[PDB]
Assembly symmetry: C3
Homo-oligomer: 20 residues x 3
């Protein structure tokens, strides 16, 4: 439940945006 | 053997902490 | 096609460098 979890979510978006 | 390897280790911890 | 894609490329290099 740590706030750092937000960073992980961003990573996922970054990977998807890789095609962008 | 580069010191940057430490960053990779942190990434792993971040992924696990994702459930936190 | 976003410039952020460069960050993703770096991540890949970091993972490989993990053995370094
Ligand atoms: C979340 C994350 C972590 C690492 C080590 C690298 C990338 C691209 C994303």
């Amino acid at each position: 439940k740590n706030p750092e979890a937000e960073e992980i979510t961003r990573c996922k978006k970054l990977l998807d945006d890789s095609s962008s």
